[PDB]
Ligand binder design. Structure first.
Ligand SMILES: *[C@@H]1O[C@H](CO)[C@@H](O)[C@H](O)[C@H]1NC(C)=O
Lengths: 49, 33, 49, 49
């Protein structure tokens, strides 16, 4: 419901969970979706620390 | 090395075969000059 | 594919004594030659076919 | 017979050939760890990401 300001941006840590990026990538709600060092279509079968 | 496409091939003549040639040369030198 | 790490080879049980914080080992070629199974925590040796 | 038995360096000329060849192969393998400007020395990392 509420977002942070740009000067005091908010860091949320995501961990110990199973992600699903197909719900984000295949959504039409986003005007910008730019990935660096990783391809959005491959992001759905990788693991991160 | 092996697992990166790098291999080593064996010599055609074995160490035993080389030793045999050496023995023949020594035997010749000693008995027939 | 181990936690996102893809490759081909023969897997066997390892006798390498990994410390609890270590998940894999590497060779001089920067290739992985041992991994910790993410579910069983067993250490496996990786040798090319 | 005694001179060779007591002189470790006597056969250095033959050992030098062995050492030079081993050095060349070890160098060749280690170069597989170089990025050469790539994101990773590991080809599988590039393809999976
Ligand atoms: C789940 O993974 C942990 C190690 O992270 C392991 O000790 C445990 O036995 C696993 N549970 C099952 C049912 O395999």
């Amino acid at each position: 419901t509420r977002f942070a300001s740009v000067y005091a941006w908010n860091r949320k840590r995501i961990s110990n969970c199973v992600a699903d990026y197909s719900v984000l990538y295949n959504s039409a709600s986003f005007s910008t979706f730019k990935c660096y060092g990783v391809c959005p279509t491959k992001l759905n079968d990788l693991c991160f620390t | 090395q092996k697992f990166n496409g790098l291999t080593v091939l064996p010599p055609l003549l074995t160490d035993e075969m080389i030793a045999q040639y050496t023995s023949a040369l020594l035997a010749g030198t000693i008995t027939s000059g | 594919n181990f936690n996102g790490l893809t490759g081909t080879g023969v897997l066997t049980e390892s006798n390498k004594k990994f410390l609890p914080f270590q998940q894999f080992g590497r060779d001089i070629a920067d290739t992985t030659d041992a991994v910790r199974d993410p579910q069983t925590l067993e250490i496996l040796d990786i040798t090319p076919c | 017979q005694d001179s060779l038995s007591s002189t470790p360096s006597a056969l250095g000329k033959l050992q030098d050939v062995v050492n030079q060849n081993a050095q060349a192969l070890n160098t060749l393998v280690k170069q597989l760890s170089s990025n050469f400007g790539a994101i990773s020395s590991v080809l599988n990392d590039i393809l999976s990401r």
